[PDB]
Scaffold this motif. Sequence first.
Motif, PDB file in Angstrom:
ATOM      1  N   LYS A  55      13.039  32.231  56.640  1.00  0.00           N
ATOM      2  CA  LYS A  55      11.604  32.020  56.788  1.00  0.00           C
ATOM      3  C   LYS A  55      10.752  33.206  56.343  1.00  0.00           C
ATOM      4  CE  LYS A  55      11.853  30.794  61.168  1.00  0.00           C
ATOM      5  NZ  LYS A  55      13.294  30.456  61.326  1.00  0.00           N
ATOM      6  N   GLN A  56      11.304  34.418  56.289  1.00  0.00           N
ATOM      7  CA  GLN A  56      10.461  35.602  56.174  1.00  0.00           C
ATOM      8  C   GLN A  56      10.727  36.449  54.937  1.00  0.00           C
ATOM      9  OE1 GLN A  56       7.890  36.371  58.259  1.00  0.00           O
ATOM     10  NE2 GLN A  56       8.297  34.404  59.261  1.00  0.00           N
ATOM     11  N   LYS A 113       7.573  25.775  50.680  1.00  0.00           N
ATOM     12  CA  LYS A 113       7.576  25.716  52.136  1.00  0.00           C
ATOM     13  C   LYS A 113       7.355  27.088  52.756  1.00  0.00           C
ATOM     14  CE  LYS A 113      10.405  22.834  54.060  1.00  0.00           C
ATOM     15  NZ  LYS A 113       9.431  21.933  54.737  1.00  0.00           N
ATOM     16  N   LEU A 114       7.969  28.124  52.195  1.00  0.00           N
ATOM     17  CA  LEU A 114       7.849  29.441  52.791  1.00  0.00           C
ATOM     18  C   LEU A 114       6.496  30.056  52.443  1.00  0.00           C
ATOM     19  CD1 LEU A 114      11.465  30.742  52.250  1.00  0.00           C
ATOM     20  CD2 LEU A 114      10.467  29.580  54.234  1.00  0.00           C
ATOM     21  N   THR A 115       6.103  31.054  53.231  1.00  0.00           N
ATOM     22  CA  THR A 115       4.725  31.525  53.269  1.00  0.00           C
ATOM     23  C   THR A 115       4.499  32.822  52.509  1.00  0.00           C
ATOM     24  OG1 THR A 115       5.090  32.742  55.327  1.00  0.00           O
ATOM     25  CG2 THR A 115       4.482  30.426  55.503  1.00  0.00           C
ATOM     26  N   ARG A 133      15.640  37.638  60.256  1.00  0.00           N
ATOM     27  CA  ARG A 133      14.436  37.362  59.481  1.00  0.00           C
ATOM     28  C   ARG A 133      13.425  38.501  59.589  1.00  0.00           C
ATOM     29  NH1 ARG A 133      16.250  32.588  61.514  1.00  0.00           N
ATOM     30  NH2 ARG A 133      16.751  30.992  59.946  1.00  0.00           N
TER      31      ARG A 133
END
Lengths: 179, 203
Positions: free
Chosen positions: B145-146, B173-175, B117
């Motif tokens: 996630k990244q 959901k992911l940033t 990630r």
Amino acid sequence: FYEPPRAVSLFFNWKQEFKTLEVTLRDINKLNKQDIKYLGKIFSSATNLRLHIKRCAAMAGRLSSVLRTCKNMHTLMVEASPLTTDDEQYITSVTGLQNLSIHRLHTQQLPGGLIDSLGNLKNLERLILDDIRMNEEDAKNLAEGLRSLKKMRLLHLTHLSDIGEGMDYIVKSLSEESC
Amino acid sequence: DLQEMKLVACCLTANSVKVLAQNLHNLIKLSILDISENYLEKDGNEALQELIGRLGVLGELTTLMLPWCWDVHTSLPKLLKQLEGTPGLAKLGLKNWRLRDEEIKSLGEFLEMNPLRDLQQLDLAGHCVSSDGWLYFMNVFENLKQLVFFDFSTEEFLPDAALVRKLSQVLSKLTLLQEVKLTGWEFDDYDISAIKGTFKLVT
């Protein structure tokens, strides 16, 4: 579900982990592709699907066409609607179907359908039969389908005619092992 | 001292990738690699696998941009196998590989065994993964996630609403969603109006 973009909007804003949804299908007569695709794409909101057929005329042959996207299905009920042999083959095609009901079949049960490919519903537990037009040999091959599935827990064979001496094959199929 | 080598839309040969895979061991600091937007006529499988077998010698490479050629998803498990040998990557671009469910679940066991990630931009162009492999691809992308900037464009594919709703759940959901590209798709009213967030959509 009487006789619908608002409920399509309602499920199509947020999707979370719904456990089970119950679908009440009431008197489907008009049948356009937009409601087929919308009401088809609603049905993935839950982890299990309880489909209820209630006197739907437009779904006489459109069982597999609408439910092709609908992989998620748990149980199904048949209430007074026409049905084809290949649609019964679509009923036996799915494996996640665990409980099934059928009522008011006036037409003769054709071979190569539900009772002939019966042994595919490997998680069948509750099975409901009412008002089915058959004969003795159809009940025999029905009981041959009963010899396959060994996870059943609940059986209904109500209101059946033309079944002379088929009950020896049915009860013979049921009383084999401690089921 | 070369650290970025970027070549696109250039007439590369199997001789170019070959001799590159014969003298690439001398070049050390070349940590950023773009050979994408190109085509290999013959032995792109062979010069690709020999090339990545040379790329296992490296220890700085974080940017890989790879082109399209013929008979490639046999080179996918050896690319992903040398990335099982490679615990570091940050930029991944993969152009027109025509992958299927088996390759995307090979990537599934890859990311579910190798947590990588540091990756920030990702391209997955032109592939015919089926809808259930898109859903399981949202399980694999759910594992991530990244990822920051990416492109999942392919041929004219009608998605299912399960893919749309997992896309809203995991993309919501992911940033680090800066810009997302999906070209060749059908999202009409509710599906297109049910996604929008911090990203930048490209049709």
